[PDB]
């Protein structure tokens, strides 16, 4: 089938998405950056590391229940066409395509993600996969290409792996309420959320002995050094995992190991940490069942399906606008 991919991001986007958010972050209380910048090359395949550590049971806990369900979904949502917010390389997105092509109903791929190199490739291999499959990848961002999502059939929206967690409920809120928008009626989200659990689990799932995690976290300073040409000591920086206990959401710092000096290069910007500084570069909410249907609710859609692994660890949503 044919491939097409729509890129709404200007060539460099990126670069200056990264200048607002390191200019902004490194100059509030405490400091923090966002945690869209982890996934250079390295922290991809960092992060690829992590999804095998066997501390880090998301990736297997919904793995489990897409095995199990998928057909349920495929035969739930009724759907002809898979948008993925994601990249659209995991196996799980193989799971899906498999349920609505094995239905009968696959007609159409639309990956959804920032990296244009990304969704090239993907779009390839489906082309080269699923025959009969027409892919329509958009290069664009949750904030302003929703809209941009191609339209005509059933659409199941598919955002997996809990990183609805990495939006803090302000933000969670209004994007689910602009996916909700942008979905028509007879539409169905798929949606993957990390439960609230026992804590020494989750810090360790954040925290894995051999340090991948310290490596994916300590990345973000390579990346901020490498492309606004910044002077981070990346080893006077130490990762720390922090369960969060009164925002039941699990948050990755940077502890600066005594008092350091970071000149941002290309952006005639200093910044002073004080010994044993903590700076805050992710948050990874945790959720309860019930709250999951009730944000879903709030946004518009009304869930139909919720799921679990078999030992209560994560949970699959299936709602319908
Ligand atoms: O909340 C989480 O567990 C993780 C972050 C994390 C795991 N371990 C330490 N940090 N976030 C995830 S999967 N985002 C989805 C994504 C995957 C690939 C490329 C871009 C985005």
Not at 77 to 89: F, I, M, Y
Not at 204 to 209: L, S, T
Not at 216 to 239: T, W
Request: charged content about 25%; overall charge negative.
């Amino acid at each position: 089938g044919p491939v097409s991919v729509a890129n709404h991001l200007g060539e460099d986007a990126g670069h200056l998405a990264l200048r607002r958010d390191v200019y902004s972050g490194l100059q509030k209380t405490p400091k923090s950056l966002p945690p869209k910048w982890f996934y250079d090359t390295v922290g991809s395949e960092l992060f690829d590391q992590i999804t095998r550590l066997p501390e880090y049971y998301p990736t297997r806990a919904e793995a489990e229940i897409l095995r199990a369900r998928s057909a349920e979904v495929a035969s739930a949502c009724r759907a002809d066409t898979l948008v993925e917010l994601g990249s659209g390389t995991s196996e799980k997105t193989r799971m899906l395509l498999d349920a609505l092509r094995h239905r009968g109903s696959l007609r159409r791929f639309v990956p959804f993600d920032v990296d244009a190199s990304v969704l090239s490739a993907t779009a390839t291999a489906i082309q080269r996969e699923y025959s009969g499959v027409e892919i329509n990848a958009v290069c664009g961002d949750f904030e302003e290409h929703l809209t941009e999502i191609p339209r005509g059939g059933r659409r199941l929206f598919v955002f997996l792996g809990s990183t609805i967690g990495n939006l803090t409920p302000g933000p969670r809120a209004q994007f689910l309420t602009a996916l909700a928008g942008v979905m028509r009626p007879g539409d169905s989200l798929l949606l993957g959320t990390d439960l609230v659990k026992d804590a020494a689990r989750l810090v360790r799932a954040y925290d894995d002995p051999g340090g991948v995690t310290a490596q994916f976290n300590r990345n973000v300073l390579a990346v901020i050094n490498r492309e606004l040409e910044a002077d981070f000591d990346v080893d006077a920086f130490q990762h720390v995992a922090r369960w969060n206990s009164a925002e039941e959401r699990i948050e990755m710092w940077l502890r600066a190991d005594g008092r350091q000096r970071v000149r941002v290069g290309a952006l005639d910007l200093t910044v002073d940490f004080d010994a044993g500084e903590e700076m805050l570069t992710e948050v990874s909410c945790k959720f309860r069942p019930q709250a999951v249907g009730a944000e879903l609710a709030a946004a518009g859609l009304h869930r139909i399906r919720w799921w679990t692994d078999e030992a209560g660890d994560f949970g699959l949503s299936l709602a319908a606008k």
